[PDB]
Amino acid sequence: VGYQPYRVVVLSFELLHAPATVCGPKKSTNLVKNKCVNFNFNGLTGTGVLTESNKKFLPFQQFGRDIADTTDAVRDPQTLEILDITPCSFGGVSVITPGTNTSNQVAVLYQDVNCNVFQTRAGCLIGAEHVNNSYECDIPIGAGICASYQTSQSIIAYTMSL
């Protein structure tokens, strides 16, 4: 037993900058769509939603670009479905203040974020009620809609009067 032929194989590893081509990861996790999630489809680390597109990819491609040259279309290697990529963070926040010596409450406006709470054309407006009546407006918001403090009394949002 001490002089027998033994076939020795050495399996070494290399530590250098390159993507892990040889790996043992999970073959398929759960598939989630229509929420802003993070994915790694062999070419990117992008955070965005995955909508069901209606465009068919040629059977030799993996990614998809646009006029602005941005990765907004990827092909899922599970069963060959085409999913779009759209960022979930759009614009910023804004605050509507009636002014000094008039009120204390304020309203929060979101620029390009889709949702007391009124879904305006210019995003989401919260803290201000919506009234179908139209008067002259003083505080601009955008897209033909203003905000004002009227009758107790609270902050209202309405279409401006011409």
Binding site: K55, F60, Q62, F63, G64, R65, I67
Partner: protein, 287 residues
Amino acid sequence: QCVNLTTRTQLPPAYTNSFTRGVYYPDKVFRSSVLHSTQDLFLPFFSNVTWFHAIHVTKRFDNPVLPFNDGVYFASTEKSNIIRGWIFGTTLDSKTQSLLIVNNATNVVIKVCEFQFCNDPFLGVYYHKNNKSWMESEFRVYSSANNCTFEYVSQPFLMDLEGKQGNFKNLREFVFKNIDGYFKIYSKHTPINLVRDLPQGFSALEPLVDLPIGINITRFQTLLALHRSYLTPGDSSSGWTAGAAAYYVGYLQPRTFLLKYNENGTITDAVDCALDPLSETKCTLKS
């Protein structure tokens, strides 16, 4: 094993003109309704491209070992499936890693080893007296090989071994590239009814297989198959036939190309920048 040929009267090579040929997909992304310009090895439009004949009616058989530059363009108006495959290498003397891309009648193999290549490898087709079909019998491509690493088998494409003298009905194009030792193959079958002076139509080329060998290539040579019927004595010295075939060999150059994409995602037209002032104006304005 291989045998030597006997000197005979041949035909000098001809020179023809390309017409919007040699355009392939340079990337693995999807582009729709955009005009994107990239730097890659393409065939320039209206470039001066070599022409080689293979028709028997005489006795034309000219397959020189052409040097392999930074990408080649290979177009064949194959009708009777006379051409079989290609070989690659540097010295072809069992010293470097040569290539055997041979599309046999049963299966397609990709073998990259140090095979002892003779001065004229070819495939011989014999005609049986009892069986009214053509089968390949003379498999004289190499002698032996010592060692190698890479091997691949493609899909079992079906070949017809019958050769005729009629007009061509199909056109096949092939592009071979080697960047960072990484082999690229682009091909597309396009039917056409022509014998020479290829039409001005546009057809982008989609790859089939993508092979990471990791060697250097400076020369290449093409393989043609002849027929041994009852008319010829059957000796490969002075009497043989090869049907009717014609293949074009073109060299790629580093050129900037403007590619047009439709709503489907395919290439419709291409505009150069170092060919015509009008083309330069079109590609600089990105329209």
